[PDB]
Design a protein around this ligand. Structure first.
Ligand code: CLF
Ligand code: CLF
Ligand SMILES: [Mg+2]
Ligand SMILES: [Mg+2]
Ligand SMILES: [S]
Ligand SMILES: [Zn+2]
Lengths: 464, 461, 464
C-alpha cells in the first residue's frame, strides 16, 4: 500500500480550507479569561473572524481592532495600536491580557509591535498603577501558514509573555494539557478522563463555557476559563501532554526548554488506539492507574461500533479534510471501523512538516488500499476529483465544504471547524472513546438518511 | 456419538437431539430426533406456526393483503422484521393488517370483526384485490370459520380473491407446521384457478426461494438470459395470481425443500411436473444447478455460455476470499436448510470448516442431508437452546457464526463476529455473485480491527 | 382553540402502533437483575419480542417460553408452566425472579396460574432449600390494552409479589422513582439529577446497563440493575415519584395503599416546564434544594433551543405518535419551541382514560391552533390523513412509522420505542433539560438535511 503526498498543482486557491493566521490567533485568545485580543490591521480582519466564531459556536466573542486607515497605512500604525490598548484598558476595567495580533497590512508596513508594547507598558503603568495588563506580541502575517499556525503562534506567545513575567516557583503537581483546536465537548470529555483518573490538570485553553447558559439573572458567562494564573502555573507542571503536533506542541516544547517541564507529544486521540495510547502516556507520566470506568466507556464504544463496521462501513470510500491533526487522526479512526480513507486533504503550506509526521508511516502500515494526501489543498481540489470520477461514499469535513457534498449527493459528517450548518456539534465530543462512538454513529446516521432519500435498500435498516 | 452437554444434565432427553460425528460411525444409528415437541423453559430458538405461514411464505407476495385474524400483537410482531424486496415499492414490507380482536370477540365470536376488517382493507387500498387471511392462537381457539367468511366476502365482492390459512401458534411444534398448512391449502384450492400466457418453449416454477435481499431477482437474470419463462416464483418477488398458474410449468426447481417441498410433491402427483432439487447458494453448486436445468430443457450450450461468463466475472474474487478464509471455523445456527446448502459449499468454494450447526425446526430429512454433507468432529444440533450455544462455543471455538441478529449481538460479547444467516448482511447471497457477497461479509466480519481492540485491557502494562 | 379527541373509525388495524400486553410485560421483566420472564403461550409470543428488543437495543435479552402445543390447547397448559419454571431453575442457578406472563392463548383456555405457582413454590422449596425464587403471576391478555398496559401490569405484579414476601422494614430515606418506559439514556440523566440534588433514589427499573460494554474479559453485563432487595425496599421509601401515568403510576398507588408511601404523579418530564415541575416536586418531598448545576443545564438547553425556535420551528406542523405519556409530553415540548403539534396519535383502547388526562386541558390553554388527538389509532391513520391533504413539516415517532415519512418526504425524528432504524438513540436522553436540547437539535438537524436534499433554501444554513 502506497500513501502518496502531493501538493496542489495550482497557484491560486478556489474555496479555501482554512482562514489566515490572525484568525487562529484570535481563536487562541478568546479562550483566556479577561482577555480581549487586539488585531492590528484593517477592520475586516477582526469583524469577519468574530462572525466566523458566531457561525461555529452561535455566540459572541470580544475581539477589538486597531482600525488601520489610509493615514496609518502610509505613515505607520503604531499610534493605532497604542490608542487601542489604552481604549481597551480604560473601558474594560477587568481586562488583563491583550494579545496584539499582526495582520498582512501591519506586517508589510513593518510596524514595530514590541516598541509599541514598551510605550503602552509605560503609559499603562502611569495611568493604572494598580493594574497589570499583559501585552503579548503575536506575529501572524497572513501570507504564511494558516489559522492552524496562527493559533499555535498565539498560544506560544501568550505563554512566553506570562511565564516570562512570573517564572518558575512552587511545583504544582499538575499536568499541562494542550488539546489543540477542539470543541467544548472535547474539553468536557478530557476533564472527565482526568477526573476519573485522579489526575490534576489544566487544559489550555479551557473553552467549556463557550457553550454558555441563558440564565435567569441575565449574566453573561461566555468566556474562556484559562486565567493568567493558570498560564503562569504551566512553568510548575509535572509534565505537558501535547495532543496536537500543529496546535500547541510548540508551547509544550518551549516550556520544556525554558522550565524543564517534560513535554510528551502523543497522537491526537481520535479513535480507539490513539485514545488508549494517550491514557497509557498519562498513566506513565503520573503514576496513576487507568480506571475501570474508562475500560467500560471504551467497551461501550467498541460495542456500538461493532454494530456498524462490517455491516455498513466496510469498503466504503471516504474523503477527509480539516486541520492536519484531525485529518490524520480521523483517517486512523476510519480504518479501525473498516472505512477506507482514500483521500485526505490538508489545507496549508506546511507540507515539509507533514511529510515527516509519524502518522504517515502508521497509515502506510495499516492501509489495505492506496491513500492520496493532498497538502496545500483547497476544497476545489476535492470537487475537481469528484468531477473527474472519484467515487466516494462519505465526506468528513467542516461546513464550508457543504456544497460539494450536497451537489455530488454524497453523505457528509461535519467535523472540525467551523461546523455552522448543523446544530449542537460543538457540544459533542469527537476525541476519546465516547467521541469515537459519537463519530461512528453520526456516520451511520448520515448513511441511513441517505439510503432513505435515495431509496437505496432503505428496507435494510430493520434487523441490523 | 450422541452428546449429553453439561448444561443439559437436567434435561437429558436433549442428548437424542445432538450428534457429534465421529470416524467410522454408521450415521444411520445417530440421526437426531427432530421435529418433536419443545422442552418448556429452555430458551429454544423456535417460533410458531403462524410465523411459518405469514412471515416466511405468504407475506413475501407483492400484491396481497396479509390479514391476521387475531389480537394486534401477532401483526405487530411480523412487521419490519423481514428483508424481501419487491419491484413494486416493497408493498409487502410497508404494511401489516390485523382484525384487532378484543374481549367481546372472544366472548361472542370474531367472524363479523374479520369480515368488517376485510372490507375495510379492500376499501382503503382499492388497487389491491388479493388477500390471505391467517388464524392465530385465540381465533383458532374460539372456532371462527375464516374460510366461510372469505367465501362470503368473495360472493359480495366479486373482483377480489381470498385464501385462508389455519395456523394458530400452538399448532405443530415450530414454524414448520405453518409451511405445510399453507402449501397444501394452496395447491388444493388455488392452483389451476387461472392461466397465463406462455411465452417460451421452456417453462419452470422456482419453488422455495423468498427473495431475501433480492436473491430471486438475481437468479431471474439467469433465467432471462437462458430464455426460460418462470411461470411462478414460490414466493420471492411473486404475485398471488402467478401462484394460481403453477400447473402450467414444465419443471419445478426446488431450493427450499423444507418449506416448499410439499407443493412440489403435490404438483408432481397431480400434474406430472418433475421435481428437481438444487442448491442455489454456493458457487460450484449454482453451476451444477444451471447445468441440470439446461440438460432438462436441451439448452446445454446456453448454460455453458452463462456459466463461463459468470465464472470469468466472479471466480477471481471468490478465489481471493478463499485464500483469506481458508481454515476458518464457522457455525451455522439457522432454520435448517441453510445448514445442508452451506456446509460443503463454504468448504469447497471458500475453504471454510463448519464446526457446529443447529436447526430450529428441521425434520429428520434435513439432518440426513446435513450429516451426509458435513464434517467429522462437527456438532449437529436439533432445536438448540441458548445455554447449548455457549457450551458449543467453548467446545469448537468458531471464528464466525452465521445466525440471527439477536444471537449475533450475544456472541459479540465473547468477541465472536457474526453474519446474519437469515436476512444477510450485504446480500443477495444466492447465485455466483451472491456467494462472493457472502464471502465478503464473512471476510469483513473476521478481518475486523474491533475484535482485536476489544481484547486489549488498557490497564495492562 | 380546540383539542378534539376522536377514535379510529375503522374496526381493523393497518400498521399497529404498539405491540400486545405480553410484550410490555416482558420489557418490564428484563429490567430486573437475575430475572427471566416465562411467557405462557405459543412460541412466537416470546421469540418475536426478543427480536423486537434486539431491534431497539441491539442486544440480547433472556425470556423463555412455555411452548404451548396442541395437546395443551385441548386439555390445558398448566404442566407447561410447571415444567418451564423447573427447567429455568435447574439450568440458571442464579435466577431469582420469574414473572409468569399470560398470553391470548392461555387467557382464553383459563390456565390457573396461581395454582401452578403454588405447585412450583412447593417443588422449588423442596428441591432448592437455601434458594428463593419469586414467581409473579402476570395476567396480560392481548385482546385488551397494549404493551403499555402490560408493562404497568407486570411492574405492579412483581412489586406486589416481592413486597408481599418482605413487608415493611426500617425507613430507607430514599425515593422510589418509576420513570416509565424510557431509554437507558433517560435513566442516566435521572441518576445524574438525583445525584446533583443529593437525593437517594431507586429508579425502577434501572436499565442503564442494557447498553453494555464489549469487555476484554468477555463478560456479559447486559442486565437490569434493579434487584430483589431494591424492589423490597420500595416499601420503606420516603415517597414515590411516578413520572408516567400509564407506565408505573399504578405501582406507586399500590405502594401508597399498602405501605403508606405517599405517591406523587407528575407530568412526564418532556420539555422545560415539565422538567421544572418534576424538580420542584422532588424538592418539596425531600426538602432538598434544586442545585445551581441544574439551573445551568436548563440555561444551556434554553440557549440551544433559542437558536432554533423562531428561525426554523415557528409555524411548522407536527404529528406525534407513541406511548401516551410520551405523546402528551412531547406535544407540550413542541409548543415551548414554537412547533405546532396538530395531530397526536395514541395507539390503544384506553381512550376513556385519556379523555381525563389533565394534560389535555393543559394543551387546550397553551395551543394557538386546533389539535386532533386520535386514540385507538394505528399508523395507517397518519398515512391516510397525509394522503387526504394534511400538510406536515415534521413527524415524531418510532421507527415502525418510517415508511410513512419516507414516502411522504417529511422529516422524521425517532422517539419512543422501538427506534431501530437509527444508531445510538437508546443512549441519548429525551427527558429533562439535556433531553429537550437533544430533541430540539435532532429536529433541526433533520430539517436541515431535508432542506439540503430537497434544495429548499439550503443556502440559509450559514448565519443562523
Ligand atoms: S481589512 Fe479587509 S479583510 Fe482584512 S486583510 Fe484587509 S482587505 Fe482583507 Fe485578509 S488575509 Fe487575513 S483577513 Fe486580514 S490578515 Fe490580511
Ligand atoms: S404463538 Fe404465534 S405470535 Fe404468539 S399469539 Fe400465537 S399465533 Fe401469535 Fe399474538 S396477540 Fe400477542 S403475540 Fe402472542 S399474546 Fe397473542
Ligand atoms: Mg450494544
Ligand atoms: Mg449558545
Ligand atoms: S421455529
Ligand atoms: Zn489486514
Amino acid at each position: 500500500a502506497e500513501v502518496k503526498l502531493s501538493p496542489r498543482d495550482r497557484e491560486g486557491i478556489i474555496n479555501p480550507m482554512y482562514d489566515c493566521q490572525p484568525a487562529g490567533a484570535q481563536y487562541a485568545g478568546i479562550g483566556i479569561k479577561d482577555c480581549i485580543p487586539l488585531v492590528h490591521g484593517g477592520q475586516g480582519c477582526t469583524m469577519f473572524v468574530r462572525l466566523l466564531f458566531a457561525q461555529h459556536f452561535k455566540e459572541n466573542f470580544d475581539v477589538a481592532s486597531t482600525s488601520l486607515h489610509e493615514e496609518s497605512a502610509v505613515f505607520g500604525g503604531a499610534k493605532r495600536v497604542e490608542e487601542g490598548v489604552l481604549v481597551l484598558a480604560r473601558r474594560y476595567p477587568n481586562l488583563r491580557v491583550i494579545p496584539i495580533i499582526t495582520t498582512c497590512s501591519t506586517e508589510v508596513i513593518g510596524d514595530d509591535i514590541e516598541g509599541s508594547i514598551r510605550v503602552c507598558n509605560r503609559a499603562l503603568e502611569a495611568e493604572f498603577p494598580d493594574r497589570k495588563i499583559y501585552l503579548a506580541p503575536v506575529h501572524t502575517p497572513s501570507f504564511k501558514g494558516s489559522h492552524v499556525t496562527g493559533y499555535a503562534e498565539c498560544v506560544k506567545s501568550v505563554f512566553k509573555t506570562i511565564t516570562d513575567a512570573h517564572g518558575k516557583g512552587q511545583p504544582s503537581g499538575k499536568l499541562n494539557v494542550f488539546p489543540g483546536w477542539v470543541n467544548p465537548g472535547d474539553v468536557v470529555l478530557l476533564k472527565r478522563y482526568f477526573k476519573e483518573m485522579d489526575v490534576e490538570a489544566n487544559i489550555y485553553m479551557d473553552t467549556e463555557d463557550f457553550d454558555s447558559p441563558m440564565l435567569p439573572n441575565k449574566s453573561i458567562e461566555t468566556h474562556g476559563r484559562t486565567t493568567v494564573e493558570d498560564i503562569a502555573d504551566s512553568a510548575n507542571a509535572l509534565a505537558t501532554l501535547s495532543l496536537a503536533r500543529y496546535e500547541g506542541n510548540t508551547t509544550g516544547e518551549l516550556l520544556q526548554k525554558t522550565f524543564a517541564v517534560p513535554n510528551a507529544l502523543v497522537n491526537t486521540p481520535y479513535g480507539i488506539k490513539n485514545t488508549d495510547d494517550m491514557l497509557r502516556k498519562i498513566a506513565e507520566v503520573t503514576g496513576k492507574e487507568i480506571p475501570e470506568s474508562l475500560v467500560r466507556e471504551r467497551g461501550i464504544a467498541l460495542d456500538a461500533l461493532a454494530d456498524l463496521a462490517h455491516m455498513f462501513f466496510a469498503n466504503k470510500k471516504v474523503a477527509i479534510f480539516g486541520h492536519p491533526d484531525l485529518v490524520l487522526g480521523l483517517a486512523q479512526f476510519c480504518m479501525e471501523v473498516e472505512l477506507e480513507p482514500v483521500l485526505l486533504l490538508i489545507g496549508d503550506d506546511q507540507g515539509n512538516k507533514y511529510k515527516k509526521d509519524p502518522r504517515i508511516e502508521e497509515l502506510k502500515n495499516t492501509a489495505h488500499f492506496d491513500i492520496e494526501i493532498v497538502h496545500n489543498a483547497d476544497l476545489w481540489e476535492l470537487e475537481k476529483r469528484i468531477n473527474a470520477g472519484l467515487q466516494l461514499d462519505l465526506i468528513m469535513g467542516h461546513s464550508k465544504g457543504r456544497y460539494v457534498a450536497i451537489e455530488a449527493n454524497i453523505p457528509m459528517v461535519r467535523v472540525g471547524f467551523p461546523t455552522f450548518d448543523r446544530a449542537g456539534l460543538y457540544r459533542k465530543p469527537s476525541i476519546g472513546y465516547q467521541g469515537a462512538m459519537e463519530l461512528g454513529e453520526m456516520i451511520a446516521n448520515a448513511m441511513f438518511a441517505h439510503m432513505e432519500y435515495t431509496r437505496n435498500k432503505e428496507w435494510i435498516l430493520n434487523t441490523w | 456419538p450422541m452428546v449429553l452437554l453439561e448444561c443439559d444434565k437436567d434435561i437429558p432427553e436433549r442428548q437424542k437431539h445432538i450428534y457429534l460425528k465421529a470416524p467410522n460411525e454408521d450415521t444411520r444409528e445417530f440421526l437426531p430426533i427432530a421435529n418433536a415437541a419443545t422442552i418448556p423453559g429452555t430458551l429454544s430458538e423456535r417460533g410458531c406456526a403462524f410465523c411459518g405461514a405469514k412471515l416466511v411464505i405468504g407475506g413475501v407476495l407483492k400484491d396481497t393483503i396479509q390479514m391476521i385474524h387475531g389480537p394486534l400483537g401477532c401483526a405487530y410482531d411480523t412487521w419490519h422484521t423481514k428483508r424481501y424486496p419487491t419491484d413494486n415499492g416493497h408493498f409487502n414490507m410497508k404494511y401489516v393488517w390485523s382484525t384487532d380482536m378484543k374481549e367481546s370477540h372472544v366472548v361472542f365470536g370474531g367472524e363479523k370483526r374479520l369480515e368488517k376488517s376485510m372490507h375495510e382493507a379492500f376499501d382503503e387500498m382499492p388497487d389491491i384485490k388479493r388477500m390471505i387471511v391467517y388464524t392465530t392462537c385465540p381465533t383458532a381457539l374460539i372456532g371462527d370459520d375464516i374460510k366461510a367468511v372469505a367465501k362470503k366476502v368473495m360472493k359480495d365482492r366479486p373482483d377480489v380473491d381470498v385464501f385462508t390459512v389455519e395456523c394458530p401458534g400452538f399448532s405443530g411444534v415450530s414454524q414448520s407446521k405453518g409451511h405445510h398448512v399453507l402449501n397444501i391449502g394452496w395447491i388444493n384450492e388455488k392452483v389451476e384457478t387461472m392461466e397465463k400466457e406462455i411465452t417460451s418453449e421452456y417453462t419452470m416454477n422456482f419453488i422455495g426461494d423468498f427473495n431475501i435481499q433480492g436473491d430471486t431477482q438475481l437468479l431471474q437474470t439467469y433465467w432471462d438470459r437462458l430464455g426460460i419463462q418462470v411461470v411462478a416464483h414460490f414466493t420471492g418477488n411473486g404475485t398471488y395470481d402467478d401462484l394460481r398458474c403453477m400447473h402450467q410449468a414444465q419443471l419445478n426447481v426446488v431450493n427450499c425443500a423444507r418449506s416448499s417441498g410439499y407443493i412440489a410433491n403435490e404438483l408432481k402427483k397431480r400434474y406430472g411436473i418433475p421435481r428437481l432439487d438444487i442448491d442455489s447458494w454456493g458457487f460450484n453448486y449454482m453451476a451444477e444447478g444451471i447445468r441440470k436445468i439446461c440438460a432438462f430443457f436441451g439448452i446445454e450450450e446456453k448454460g455453458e455460455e452463462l456459466i463461463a461468463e459468470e465464472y470469468a466475472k466472479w471466480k477471481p474474487k471468490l478465489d481471493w476470499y478463499k485464500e483469506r478464509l481458508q481454515g476458518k471455523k464457522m457455525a451455522i445456527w439457522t432454520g435448517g436448510p441453510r445448514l445442508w446448502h452451506w456446509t460443503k459449499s463454504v468448504e469447497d468454494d471458500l475453504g471454510v470448516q463448519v464446526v457446529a450447526m443447529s436447526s430450529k425446526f428441521g425434520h429428520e430429512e434435513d439432518f440426513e442431508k446435513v450429516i451426509a454433507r458435513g464434517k467429522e468432529g462437527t456438532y449437529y444440533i436439533d432445536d438448540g437452546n441458548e445455554l447449548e450455544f455457549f457450551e458449543i462455543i467453548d467446545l469448537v471455538k468458531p471464528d464466525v457464526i452465521f445466525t440471527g441478529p439477536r444471537v449475533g449481538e450475544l456472541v459479540k460479547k465473547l468477541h465472536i463476529p457474526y453474519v446474519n444467516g437469515h436476512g444477510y448482511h450485504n446480500g443477495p447471497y444466492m447465485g455466483f455473485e451472491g456467494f462472493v457477497n457472502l464471502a465478503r461479509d464473512m471476510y469483513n466480519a473476521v478481518h475486523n480491527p474491533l475484535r482485536h481492540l476489544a481484547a486489549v485491557d488498557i490497564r495492562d502494562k
